[PDB]
Amino acid sequence: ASTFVYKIKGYKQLIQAKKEEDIIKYVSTCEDGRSIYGGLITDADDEVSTLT
Amino acid sequence: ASTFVYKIKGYKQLIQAKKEEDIIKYVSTCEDGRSIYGGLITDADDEVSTLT
Amino acid sequence: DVLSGLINRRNSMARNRVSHRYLSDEEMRVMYKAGLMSKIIRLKAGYALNDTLKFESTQDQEIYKKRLSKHVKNATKFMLGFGRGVIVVFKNGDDLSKPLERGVDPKLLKIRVFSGDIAKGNNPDNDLRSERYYKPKNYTIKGHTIHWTRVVDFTYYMPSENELPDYYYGGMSESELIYEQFINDSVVQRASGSIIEKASTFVYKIKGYKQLIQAKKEEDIIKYVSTCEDGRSIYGGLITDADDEVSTLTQSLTDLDKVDNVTLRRIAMVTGLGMTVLIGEQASGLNASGEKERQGFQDTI
Amino acid sequence: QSLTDLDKVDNVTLRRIAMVTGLGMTVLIGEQASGLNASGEKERQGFQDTI
Amino acid sequence: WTRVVDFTYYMPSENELPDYYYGGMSESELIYEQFINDSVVQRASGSIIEK
Amino acid sequence: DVLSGLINRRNSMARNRVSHRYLSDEEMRVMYKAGLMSKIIRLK
Amino acid sequence: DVLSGLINRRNSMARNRVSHRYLSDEEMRVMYKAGLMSKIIRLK
Amino acid sequence: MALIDDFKARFPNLDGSLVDALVPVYENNYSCYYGGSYENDCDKEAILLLIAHLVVTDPSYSGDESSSRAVASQSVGSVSVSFVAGSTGSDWTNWLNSTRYGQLFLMVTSNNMGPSFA
Amino acid sequence: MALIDDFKARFPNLDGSLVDALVPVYENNYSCYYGGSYENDCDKEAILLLIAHLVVTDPSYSGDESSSRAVASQSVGSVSVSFVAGSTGSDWTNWLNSTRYGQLFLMVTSNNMGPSFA
C-alpha cells in the first residue's frame, strides 16, 4: 500500500562498484527503528519520498 | 505512520568520514525533547520534512 | 485464478504460509496483569458464573455458593488467563496419592485454586485404556505433586492432540487466541499517546547556525531562542530575518482510528464479547439482565 | 501549529478507560444524563454487570 | 491476620504476588498506560492554543 | 506527566498561575447599564 | 510492547512519570471567586 | 598554560617576533570566536588553527588593511584557476577559507554539526 | 604502533625530514578528522591517505599559506582545462580534492554512505 523510498545519491555507483554492502546495512539498521520517535537523518542531495 | 526527516547538508560527508558520531548525538538529544514546546533549530541549507 | 505471468508467486497465496505463535508462560503471565485483558478475563468469567447456575439440589440451597463458588470464579478466571484453571482438594493430611473415596470425603477437606502458571499437566497414558492422550494421570502443582483424581482441571479450548503437550495438557489462554491482537492494540495505543507531543514542531531554519555549531560558540543563539520560545504566543510576533525561515511541520497517525478499529473488531470476535463493550458503550445493549441485553452475547457464554 | 488529531487520540485513550474501569464511555465524556444514572431500572443497568 | 480485614482487588498470578505485596492491584496499574496518555493528551491540549 | 526535557516548564501548568480580577465599582456600574447583562440581571 | 530500537525510551511510558500539583491556599482562594467553579461549587 | 609556546611548535613557519607580538592579543579573545576548551587535545588544535588564522591575516602582520576572504577565481599573468564553488553565501566560511589555517579550522570542527533544542 | 613507519612505506615519494617533522603532529589529531580505526586493514589506508593529505597541504611543507581546494578550471600559458563538475557546494569534498591523496580519502571511504537512526 505504501513503500518508503530512499532516493540516495551515489547509490548508482555503490551498486556499480558492488561495494554496496554498507549502505544496505545502514538502511537495514535505520529501518530497524524508523518510527514516530526517531527522525531520519539524510542528505540535502538525498531525497526520501513515499509512494502509495 | 509518519517519519520525521532531517535532510541535513554535509551528512553526506560525515558518514563518509565516519566521524558522524556527534551529529547523531545532537539529533538524539534534539529528538529527546522535540515537542510542541520547543522549536527546532536548523539551517537554511538544512530541510526538515515529514513523510506519511 | 493463476496464470500468464509471475502473479502466481507474489500474491498473498504463496508469498506467505500460515503459522501460529506459542506465547511463553511468562508472557502469558504478563497479559493477565495487563489492563485490557484483565477486563476480558473478568467479564467473561463473571458472565459465566454470576447467578447462572441451575442447582437441582434445593435442600442445602447453594452450599456451593457460600464455600467455593468464589473459588471456582478465580479458578475459571485462571482458565481464560492461562489456559489452565485448577481446583485442588485434599483432606487434613497432605497426600501425593489419590483421595480416599471409599468413603467419599464428607466435607472434612480443604480447597485450593491454582493458575496454569504454577500448575501444569505431566503424565498422559498413551494407551486407550483409562484416560485417552488428553487426560493427564498425575502432575505437579509446585515442588509437590497431586494425584489425578485429587485435582479438578479447568481446561479451555484445546488444540489438536499432536501438539497438546506444547500447552502441557489442557486449554489455551485467550492471550494465545489474541496475541496477534493485544500486541497490535498496545502498539496502536503506545503510539497514540506519543504522537500528540510531536503533533507539530516549530522550526527555526536559521542561516549561519551551520557555523555557530561548527564553531561551538552556539550558546547565544540557543539562549535567544529559549527566551524567544519563552513567550512565543498569539500576542507577540516573531522577529526573524529575510534569509531566516520559520516553518511548521506536522506529523500524526493518519489512520489511527482505522487500525484501532480493525484491532478492536477482532478482539470482539475472538473473545466473543460485543464490539460495544470494547469501545466502552456498555450502556447500549450489553448489560447484566438477560431479558434482551445479556442476549447480546449469551450464546458465546 | 495545532494538534491535528487531538480528538482521535483523546478518543482512543478514553475508550480504553471506559473498558478497563468498566464505566461507560458516556461517563468519561461527561454525558452522564443519557443512560448512566443511579436508579437501577435501566440506567444503572448500563454497567451494573461490572459492579 | 485474624485481627485484620483485607479489601483485596484483582490479584495477579501467584508467581508474582509478592511484587504487589500480597493483595490486589490498583486501577492505576490497570490503566497506567491510560492515565499517563490522557494526561499527555490534556497537558498538550492546553498549551497548543497559545501557540 | 513531567520528565525528560523542558516540557516541564513551558506547558500550561507552570507557564501561568491563577489570579482573579477585582473589577472596580465604577466598572461595576457600567455593566449594569450595558445591554447584555441588563437582561441577565433582569431575567434572573 | 517494547523491543528492537530506542522506541523503549521515547514513548509516553518512560518519557514522563506521574506527579500531582498541590495548589496553594491562596490559589485555592482565587478559584472560589472565579466564575466557572463558582457555579460548580454552587451547583453541586 | 603555554598557548604562546604550544603555538610556536605547532606552526614553526609563521615568523618570530611578529607572531610573538600578536598571539598575546588574540589569546585574550579567541574564547569568543570559538567556544571550545583548550583541553580535549584535538580541540586544542582547533584553537591553534584559529589563533593562527587571526594572526596571519591580522594587518600588523601582512600589511593588508583590506579584508581577506576566499578567492573563487584568481588569475595572475598567464596562469588562471577557478576554484570549484562550495558552501557559498556565508562570510564565516569565506573568511576562514582565506588562509590555509582557517580552512583547517572549519574542518577540525566540521564534525560538531547538528540541530539542537527541540 | 608504527604510523610514522607505515606512512613512510605507503608514500615513498613525499619527502624525508619534511614528512618526518609533520606526521608526528597530524598523528596526534587525525582521530577527529576521520573516526576510523587503524585496524581493519584498508581503513588503515584511509588514515594514511588523510595523514598524507594533511601533510602535503600543510604550509610548513609546500610554503603555501593560502588555502588549498579543488580547481574547477585551470589555465596555464597556452594549455587550459575545465574539469567536469562534481559534488559541488561542499568544502569537505573540495578540500580533499585539492590533492591526489585526499581524492583517495573520499573514496576509500565513499562506500560507508547511508542514512541512520530513524
Can you tell me which residue has the cell 573563487? Answer: H72
Nine-digit cell string for G11: 514513548
Cα A28 to Cα A45, C162, G6: the distances in Å are 20, 39, 15
Q: Give C80→chain E minimum CA distance, Å.
A: 13
Q: What are phi and psi of C127, to 5 degrees?
A: -80, 165
Q: Give C252→chain B minimum CA distance, Å.
A: 6
Q: What are phi and psi of C203, to 5 degrees?
A: -130, 125
Can you tell me which residue has the cell 505431566? Answer: C122
Kindly tell me the sign of the dihedral angle through the C-alpha atoms of F18, F19, F20, F26: negative
Residues in chain D whose C lies over 2.5 Å from the next residue's N (breaks after): none
CB atoms within 10 A of CB B50: 17
**CB pairs < 8 Å spanning C and G:** 16
Interface test mutation site (partner C, options H43, H92, H95, max chain C beta carbons within 10 A) = H92
3+ Cβ–Cβ pairs closer than 8 Å linking H and G: no
Nine-digit cell string for D6: 487531538
B15: nearest CA partner in chain H: H111
Interface test mutation site (partner F, options C196, C228, C230, max chain F beta carbons within 10 A) = C230
Q: Using CB atoms, which chains have 3+ pairs under 8 A with I?
A: A, B, H
Chain C residue numbers with beta carbons less than 8 Å from the beta carbon of B37 are: 229
The DSSP symbol for I85 reads P
Q: Using CB atoms, which chains have 3+ pairs under 8 A with D?
A: C, E
Please state, in angstroms and rounded to a whole number, the distance separating the CA atoms of residues C175 and C263. Answer: 14
Chain F residue numbers with beta carbons less than 8 Å from the beta carbon of E39 are: 1
The DSSP symbol for I99 reads S
Q: Give G20→chain A minimum CA distance, Å.
A: 26
Q: Using CB atoms, which chains have 3+ pairs under 8 A with F?
A: B, C, E, G
Chain C residue numbers with beta carbons less than 8 Å from the beta carbon of G1 are: 183, 186-187, 190
Can you tell me which residue has the cell 520559520? Answer: C246
SS3 for G24?
coil
- Count of residues for chain I? 118
Q: What spatial distance separates the first Cα and last Cα of chain H, rounded to whole Å?
A: 38
3+ Cβ–Cβ pairs closer than 8 Å linking A and G: yes
B21 closest CA partner among H4, I116, C72, C131: I116
Nine-digit cell string for H101: 589555517
Helices and strands: H and E segment counts in chain E: 1, 0
3+ Cβ–Cβ pairs closer than 8 Å linking H and I: yes
- Are the Cβ atoms of C253 and A37 closer than 8 angstroms? no
Please state, in angstroms and rounded to a whole number, the distance separating the CA atoms of residues A51 and B41. Answer: 29
Contact residues, chain B to chain A, C-beta under 8 Å:
1-12, 15, 23-24, 27, 31, 34, 45-49, 51-52
- Are the Cβ atoms of F2 and G19 closer than 8 angstroms? yes
Cα C215 to Cα H50, H113, H115: the distances in Å are 10, 9, 14
- Are the Cβ atoms of D26 and C192 closer than 8 angstroms? no
- Are the Cβ atoms of D20 and E30 closer than 8 angstroms? yes
Q: What spatial distance separates the first Cα and last Cα of chain C, rounded to whole Å?
A: 40
Please state, in angstroms and rounded to a whole number, the distance separating the CA atoms of residues H68 and I108. Answer: 34
- Are the Cβ atoms of B52 and C254 closer than 8 angstroms? yes
A36: nearest CA partner in chain I: I118
Q: Give C196→chain D minimum CA distance, Å.
A: 6
Please tell me which of the candidates C183, C187, C190 has its beta carbon nearest to residue G13: C190
Interface test mutation site (partner G, options E36, E40, E41, E42, max chain G beta carbons within 10 A) = E36
Please state, in angstroms and rounded to a whole number, the distance separating the CA atoms of residues D7 and C286. Answer: 26
Please state, in angstroms and rounded to a whole number, the distance separating the CA atoms of residues D36 and D26. Answer: 7
The 3-state secondary structure of C11-27, one letter per residue: CCCCCCCCCCCCCCHHH
Kindly tell me the sign of the dihedral angle through the C-alpha atoms of G3, G7, G11, G16: positive
Q: Where are the alpha helices (DSSP H) in C11-154?
A: 25-33, 35-49, 63-67, 69-82
- Are the Cβ atoms of D13 and E51 closer than 8 angstroms? no
Cα C62 to Cα C106, C288, E8: the distances in Å are 16, 21, 24
Please state, in angstroms and rounded to a whole number, the distance separating the CA atoms of residues H62 and H55. Answer: 9
Contact status, residue D24 vs residue C214, Cβ threshold 8 Å: no
- Are the Cβ atoms of C194 and G15 closer than 8 angstroms? yes
The 3-state secondary structure of chain H, one letter per residue: CCHHHHHHHHCCCCCCHHHHCCHHHHHHHHHHCCCCCCCCHHHHHHHHHHHHHHHHCCHHHHCCCCCCCCCCEEEECCEEEEECCCCCCCHHHHHHCCEHHHHHHHHHCCCCCCCCCC
Cα I47 to Cα A17, H102, I8, I33, I40: the distances in Å are 22, 22, 13, 9, 11
CB atoms within 10 A of CB C61: 10
Strands C245-250 and C200-205: antiparallel
Contact status, residue C88 vs residue C151, Cβ threshold 8 Å: yes
Q: Give C235→chain H minimum CA distance, Å.
A: 22
Chain A residue numbers with beta carbons less than 8 Å from the beta carbon of I110 are: 10, 13-14
Can you tell me which residue has the cell 443511579? Answer: D38
Give resolution, Å, one decimal.
3.6
Contact status, residue I14 vs residue I55, Cβ threshold 8 Å: yes
E32: nearest CA partner in chain C: C35
Contacts of I72 (CB under 8 A, 6+ apart): H82, H83, H84, H85, I82, I83, I85
- Are the Cβ atoms of D17 and E34 closer than 8 angstroms? yes
Q: Using CB atoms, which chains have 3+ pairs under 8 A with B?
A: A, C, E, F, H, I
Nine-digit cell string for H27: 589569546
- Are the Cβ atoms of E38 and D1 closer than 8 angstroms? no
Interior angle at CA D34, CA D28 and CA D38, nearest 5 = 80
Q: What are phi and psi of C191, to 5 degrees?
A: -65, -30
Q: Give G39→chain F minimum CA distance, Å.
A: 14
Label residues B2-26 b or e (16+ Cβ within 10 Å = b).
bbbbbbbbbbbbbbbbebbebbbeb
- Are the Cβ atoms of H113 and B22 closer than 8 angstroms? yes
Interface test mutation site (partner D, options C282, C284, C289, C301, max chain D beta carbons within 10 A) = C282
Q: Give I71→chain B minimum CA distance, Å.
A: 19
Nine-digit cell string for G22: 498541590
Experimental technique: cryo-EM
Interface test mutation site (partner I, options H83, H88, H106, H109, max chain I beta carbons within 10 A) = H83
Strands B3-8 and A40-43: parallel
